[PDB]
């Protein structure tokens, strides 16, 4: 009984793109438990992220179009679901890393309040790692594939535009952030046998992937994350100089956009995107850099615990 498949997954919002196109929130789910079965997952190769990318491109260009008027934009949780015939099933292993067999598997129909927010380097407003901090990668061995660390406790961040001036800033508690940073350092040591760890700024080039780029309440902020990735951390409140730039390069596809001519965002940091490097002498140290690039990763970070299949 049952086999993996593909299906134009529908959506349930709890609304008050989710206008008519998403059904009201199911106010009574039913994760029905499954037993004696050890199913294999591949967060890195499912089409839930394909569906998700195409749908969010639709909503993205629809609601904040490039030049171009000015109205609100903040995401709201949007469950996804399978129609009759097809089953989402759910890995409930607290320490499942995205790839491989899960035994505490149980099936249900709608996801969990997915907040479709796209970002770089740092992951925002998502669901935390249930038990201990998780590190997700298609293979730790090959470095071209990026790393998605998923935090145990989230860290809030405040980005602010104040007077009508040129650019903006952003603030973070150095205390808890450097604590959780050393926590993930300990974990990365665990998987690379107690090796010394080194954070460094991104290589450069495509501004967005060498910056913390994200759209807050209509406008795009680029925060210099050189401070957050300090090797030697000095634990006072940390400031970031963030560029609110009117010219962007489009995550939509090939092309670049411009958006027309007192605002604030608070957000939880739930994950980080990190690229390794290449130590052939292996040093006694591995170095990590803030990553990003393919928007695809953003969705895997939240759809690792699920798989769409067909009931037979």
């Amino acid at each position, epitope marked *: 009984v049952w086999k993996d498949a593909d299906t134009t997954l529908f959506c349930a919002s709890d609304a008050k793109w989710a206008t008519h196109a998403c059904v009201p929130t199911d106010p*009574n789910p039913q994760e029905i438990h499954l037993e004696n079965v050890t199913e294999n997952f591949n967060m890195w190769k499912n089409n839930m992220v394909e569906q998700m990318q195409e749908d969010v491109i639709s909503l993205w260009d629809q609601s904040l179009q490039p030049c171009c008027p000015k109205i609100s934009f903040d995401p709201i949780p949007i469950h996804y679901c399978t129609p009759a015939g097809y089953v989402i099933l759910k890995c409930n292993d607290k320490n499942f890393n995205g790839t491989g067999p899960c035994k505490n598997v149980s*099936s249900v129909q709608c996801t969990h309040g997915i907040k479709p927010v796209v970002s770089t380097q740092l992951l925002l407003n998502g669901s935390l790692a249930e038990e201990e901090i998780i590190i997700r990668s298609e293979n730790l061995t090959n470095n071209a594939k990026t790393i998605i660390v998923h935090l145990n406790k989230s860290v809030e961040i405040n980005c602010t535009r104040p007077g009508d001036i040129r650019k903006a800033y952003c603030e973070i508690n150095g205390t808890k952030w450097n604590k959780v940073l050393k926590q993930v350092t300990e974990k990365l040591k665990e998987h690379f046998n107690n090796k010394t760890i080194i954070f460094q700024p991104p290589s450069g080039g495509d501004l967005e992937i060498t910056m913390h780029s994200f759209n807050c309440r209509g406008e795009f902020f680029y925060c210099n994350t050189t401070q957050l990735f300090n090797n030697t951390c000095c634990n006072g409140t940390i400031t970031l100089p963030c560029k609110i730039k009117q010219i962007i390069n489009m995550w939509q596809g090939t092309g670049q956009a411009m958006y027309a001519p007192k605002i604030n965002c608070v957000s939880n940091i739930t994950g980080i995107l990190l690229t390794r490097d290449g130590g052939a002498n292996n040093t006694s140290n591995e170095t990590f850099r803030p990553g990003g690039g393919n928007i695809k990763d953003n969705w895997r970070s939240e759809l690792y615990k699920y798989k769409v299949v067909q009931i037979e």
Partner: antibody
Amino acid sequence: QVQLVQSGAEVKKPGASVKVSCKASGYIFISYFMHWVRQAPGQGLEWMGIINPSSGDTRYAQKFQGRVTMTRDTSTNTVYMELSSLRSDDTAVYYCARRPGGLERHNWLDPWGQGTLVTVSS
Amino acid sequence: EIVMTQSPATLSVSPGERATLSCRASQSISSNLAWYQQKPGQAPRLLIYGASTRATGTPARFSGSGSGTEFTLTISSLQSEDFASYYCQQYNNWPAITFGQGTRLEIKR
């Protein structure tokens, strides 16, 4: 197996309230939601509400928000429906039902209590 | 928000004819739905679930296409058993399990 048993017919005066039971049998009482629907000849059927006999959670149809309430006694595995402020046009037959199946979800109303009739008269 | 609408309210057909019902959904309930049957005097019987599949325990004269917004139910070679009322059923919006006003059917004998 899949077997529901409701209460009998009942007549209690207008402006009052009534309680109709529904004993489920042939499956664990608690993992399956109990739904209540009603029929008054002159119209067809319409859904009234959802109870989770694992929680106590109730979500209702708009028209019946307030008048109807649901209850569990998950031990003698029965569900209680309670309608109140019985105006003269609530007189009708009321059915309880389940959402059978196996795995996944797909909750189609399989077993169906034979329905009790409620004549609000004087 | 998701208004369901039956197709004909009443029906009159002769034995052996074709009968067709439609269930129109004002919004994508996404290919769930279920068709039920109630004879005068008895407890409604489900005929189809998952929009399309016959519930083993009903004859193959019944069927139901749709997938998405518009749905249909077809009775081929309708017989004397069929003369009753039929209904359609949302149920993916877990609680919003809402009916249509129904479709009574009757004989031309």
